Structures are given as C-alpha cells and as structure tokens.
Assembly symmetry: C3
Homo-oligomer: 106 residues x 3
C-alpha cells in the first residue's frame, strides 16, 4: 500500500482499538498497525517523490515510522500480557503521533 493507505489503516485500527470489546482482538489491530507502519517505511509521500530515497527528509520519514513502531510495541506488549486498558490508553498517544506525522509529510 502507498503512504496514505497505510496511514488510513493505522487510523482505522486505532478506531478499532478505542472501541474494542473483542478483548484480545486489540492485539490483532495492533498487529495490523505494525504491518502498516513497516510497510509505510517503503512508501514515499507525494511531496517527497522528487527527493532522494536517502535524503534527510526521507530519513526523517522512515525514522518517524520507527518511533511509531516503538509506541506500537509499548501497546502490544501490554495487550499480550492481558492488559487491554493502558494499551487502549497508549492508543491515544499513538493517534497523536500518527496525526503529527500525517500533518508533517502531507
């Protein structure tokens, strides 16, 4: 998927997590989020299609997705132990960071 489709997947799974009664299915959503972020590291925002793939802007892009991945890890480790809460709370900081990166590179 391209960049905006991956960001849409992230937002949709954040919504699934925030309204999750399915219990451990949060992990599934989190899983998808991870698979999105990693995939988005291979994409390029349209405004950076002219830059070099290793230019400082693209490096910042991929490293921001690394930050997202570490936050997703913080949520998923709590979800795996059996703590749906706190993971659902860190989903909000995840949404904040996702919106920040979206506004940054769109």
């Amino acid at each position: 998927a391209d960049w905006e489709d991956n960001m849409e997947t992230l937002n949709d799974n954040l919504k699934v997590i925030e309204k999750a009664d399915n219990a451990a299915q949060v992990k599934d959503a989190l899983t998808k989020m991870r698979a999105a972020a990693l995939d988005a590291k291979k994409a390029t925002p349209p405004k950076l299609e002219d830059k070099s793939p290793a230019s400082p802007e693209m490096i910042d892009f991929r490293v921001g997705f690394d930050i997202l991945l570490w936050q997703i890890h913080d949520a998923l480790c709590l979800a795996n132990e059996g703590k749906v809460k706190e993971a659902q709370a860190a989903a909000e900081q995840l949404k904040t960071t996702v919106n920040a990166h979206w506004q940054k590179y769109r």
Copy 2:
C-alpha cells in the same frame, strides 16, 4: 557477517527454538536471531548486488529485515512471559518469513 551466513544463523536458531525445552533457550535463540538480523540489515543480498545501497530495492530489503526483527520481538515478549509454546508458534511465522526472504533475495 555474510548475508547467507546470517540466514544460516536464523535457520539454525529457528531449529533450536522448535526443539527448545524452557524459556531460557527460546530467549537465547531469539537473541541470536535478532543479532543475525541486525547484522544482515547491513549486508547486500546476492539479488541486489547490482543496486545502489540507497536504492528503493535495498531500502525495502532493510525494511523486510525490520519486519523480521519485530516478529522476533513478538516471540521474545511471549518468551519473557513464560509462554514457551506460544513463542514456538510465533517462531513458525518467523520461519515462514525467513524462507520468504531467502527465496526473494538469494
């Protein structure tokens, strides 16, 4: 070291995880796998020896090894909680991903 030797290490430690008896052996093998994957991130696979180190193909290669690293971390988080059988079930997905990378980049 060599990308092929790193793949050998990944396969050997997957075999170790498949026959592991406790959580310590699973954790040790997963740590060795993580080291091998981090080292292979700096390598160039045989299929991509005609591509620049910052080409999109090499970036996608490194992102694939990032995916492998996060799956390794999932297995390691399962092993830290004492869930050895869940860790081996995750090592199955690890083996699928490793075989896919081997077939893709050899």
Copy 3:
C-alpha cells in the same frame, strides 16, 4: 549539534539509571534514552558530514542505532518486571555501546 545533544542526553540518563533506586526512575530514564536515540538516528554525525546521504556509512550508522534501541528495549523489559539491578547491568552494557557509537561518530 543535535546528534551531540542526543548523545549527551543518553549519557545523562545512563548516569541517572546507575544512580537509581526504584523501577519507575529507570523506566523514565530509559524512555528518555529511547527518544534521544530515535531522534539521533535521523541525524548526521559530525564525522560523516562530508559523506553523501546515500553512503553505506550512514546506513551502518542507522543500523547501529537500531542495535542500541534493541539493547534499550531489553533494559526496559528488565525494568518493567521489577528487576532493578539487572536493568542497571543492562544499562552498563548500554553505556558501553553508547560511548562506542559516540566516540566512533564524533
């Protein structure tokens, strides 16, 4: 510049961990360390300023930061399970790695 500031932040939080008592202090210092390491991964160290962004030196630099991040994660996992002294030993290993990277790329 900012990479140097991130290295100094890493060193300060390593000192904080070495002089810590409970797990919350170690966790907070390790979270600050993760933030600083991620922020420095997308920077250019002074030794590599004369190199192209597409050079393999920068790729190895970022991969070394990935290694440092995973060591930070191991320390944070030790701290999250109420293991303070083990987290401090892991943080001494982190100090070794951080000083290695700092004196290598400064």
